[PDB]
């Protein structure tokens, strides 16, 4: 039952926790209410950690929509980069990266809501409480990528946001 200081599972834990931290910061910096995100933190954690460990998680998706129209105002994708090696490489959680992009994302509508989904590889293990979902349309939108947002020894989440035109 040896526990290694540097390991894939430590890197997975770091990236899991700080992807969720980063999404919470996006919600806060966007002026939204984090309660709904709080209420599902543990279930979001269990699923993200599981599917990272098997290489099955493709993206973490946070839809931010206008409740009056149900349309996306923006969508934040955290694409997973499976470039891990050794486990003793450099790491970071670049909150300042998100604050620079969120200025460019633009003001959100009053009382905008959000929804988290997980993009997975078909052969993924089932995780209790998770079912096939649906995307809100991104027609007329393109994605802006920001670079490595959450990093630990090559395993990374790279944030991006969808915008109009």
């Amino acid at each position: 039952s040896t526990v290694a200081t540097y390991s894939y599972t430590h890197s997975v834990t770091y990236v899991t926790d700080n992807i969720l931290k980063s999404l919470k910061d996006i919600i806060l910096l966007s002026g939204l209410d984090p309660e709904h995100f709080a209420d599902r933190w543990e279930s979001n954690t269990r699923a993200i950690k599981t599917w990272l460990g098997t290489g099955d998680l493709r993206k973490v998706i946070l839809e931010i929509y206008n409740p009056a129209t149900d349309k996306l105002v923006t969508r934040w994708d955290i694409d997973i980069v499976y470039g891990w090696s050794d486990g003793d490489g450099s790491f970071w959680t670049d909150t300042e990266q998100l604050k620079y992009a969120i200025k460019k994302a633009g003001l959100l509508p009053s009382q905008a809501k959000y929804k988290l989904m997980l993009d997975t590889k078909p052969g993924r293990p089932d995780v209790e409480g998770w079912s096939k979902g649906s995307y809100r349309s991104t027609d007329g939108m393109v994605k802006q990528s920001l670079g490595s947002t959450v990093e630990h020894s090559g395993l990374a989440g790279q944030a991006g946001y969808w915008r109009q035109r």
Binding site: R40, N44, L118, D119, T120, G133, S134
Partner: peptide, 7 residues
């Protein structure tokens, strides 16, 4: 890929 939501 298959997108998943919580239930």
């Amino acid at each position: 890929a298959e997108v998943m939501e919580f239930n």
